[PDB]
Design a protein around this ligand. Sequence first.
Ligand code: HEM
Ligand SMILES: O=C(O)[C@H](Cc1ccccc1)NC(=O)[C@@H]1CCCN1C(=O)OCc1ccccc1
Ligand SMILES: C[C@H](N)c1ccccc1
Length: 454
Amino acid sequence: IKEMPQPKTFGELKNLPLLNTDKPVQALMKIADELGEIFKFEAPGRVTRYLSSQRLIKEACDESRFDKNLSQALKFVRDFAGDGLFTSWTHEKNWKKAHNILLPSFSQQAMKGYHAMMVDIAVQLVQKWERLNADEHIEVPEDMTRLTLDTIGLCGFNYRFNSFYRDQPHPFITSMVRALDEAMNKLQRANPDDPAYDENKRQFQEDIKVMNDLVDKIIADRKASGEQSDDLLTHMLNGKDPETGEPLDDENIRYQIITFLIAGHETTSGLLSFALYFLVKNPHVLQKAAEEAARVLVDPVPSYKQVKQLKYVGMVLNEALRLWPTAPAFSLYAKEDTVLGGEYPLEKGDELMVLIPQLHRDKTIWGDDVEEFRPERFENPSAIPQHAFKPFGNGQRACIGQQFALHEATLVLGMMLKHFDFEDHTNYELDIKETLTLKPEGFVVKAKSKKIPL
Ligand code: HEM
Ligand SMILES: O=C(O)[C@H](Cc1ccccc1)NC(=O)[C@@H]1CCCN1C(=O)OCc1ccccc1
Ligand SMILES: C[C@H](N)c1ccccc1
């Protein structure tokens, strides 16, 4: 039994001003490097503890001992995501209900049904790049977000955002991004009292109304037509929870749609961006990956079966998730009084934060080379210890979208590597923008077509 280290303090603000930065996760990563596997973090009326070691995170991941907590970031996202899967407590009736209805829609099996629609968007990405002139470059995060948003639109609700036809966002996305922006900015802030932030508050209320009206219309216009298009919206309108026997009500369905639209703008787009970054910075790896893409994707249109064969492309994506897990933290609470790691006594209710990028750098798991991009670490998936690798979180509150994310990222990265050579023509310096998620800002490449017909 021993006392926790704590980073530097600002009198009565405690540690809060440490979050007065547009890169809080990165600042928390540098604090973990200084203080080690566990530190205390206090704000006025709040105390959490950041975990960085596999030794302590394997205990936090014990579902008999700890459950999902909504962090301050999750409570602010709930103002527009409501009791959707990502922002609901495990004990809220709508969590288990929604989880049991949607779990079949997100299985490895359901991916065979989404495949055609994903390919439709991936082919739009490849044609865009095939049609660039010699002088031009690729804005990598911008194009990946166009792809992932369009993919979740079409598979989710049979809606085309047509992001490859635009350089200005949909009225929904403007509100959605501006809501999320306001939600992360609030973390550091003084209070919800300053008249200054009323304008930020006014705007936030108009954005919640805009997202709510446009998604409530979508539900309404789909119940209008009676059409049964095999999409998440159909599954949610017809689907019945086997426990309660009930379907979701229209309000919860609107919350699920908002939740899914954010995920598929903010997470998979980041994975693909990091993955391409590590590939252009590691030529030997790009070469192994492009060899597999060219051998496997022998048809102009990739099949489900062919994407499952891209083992090494899978390993690249897992290595990108290891260094830069795009949803970098999740929050837990003690269900009862308990002792963490034989050393840190917690009371019932006490909060933990899992710093996933730090977990993924634990030299006692991964060796001394933790900063190296080596997809070969993942050649043998049973060599990875339990709870050493948690990019999709933990237990029943893990990412429902995991197989959807990996199928889309494997398909698209497969096709990119099949169709183009890539040049890091600016020698890009990694600059990680923090929203809810991580993305590489300003990441630009050139592609040189291999002139393979679609
Ligand atoms: C590479 C992409 C993604 C990563 C790294 C990721 C990561 C995560 C993680 C770490 C959690 C746990 C959060 C927590 O404990 O607070 C989570 C939950 C969730 N994710 Fe994802 N995600 C990704 C893509 C997606 C996609 C594409 C969707 C939807 C189509 C999605 C939907 C969700 C939902 C609904 C939850 C809450 C599930 C529940 O608790 O019942 N995610 N994700
Ligand atoms: O939101 C929190 O409670 C903490 C930050 C905090 C604020 C006030 C007092 C004490 C701690 N959040 C976090 O540690 C991290 C860093 C910034 C975002 N974040 C987070 O966990 O956001 C929720 C989230 C959403 C989506 C994906 C991962 C994580
Ligand atoms: C990280 C998680 N997959 C997420 C879910 C919904 C909205 C934003 C993020």
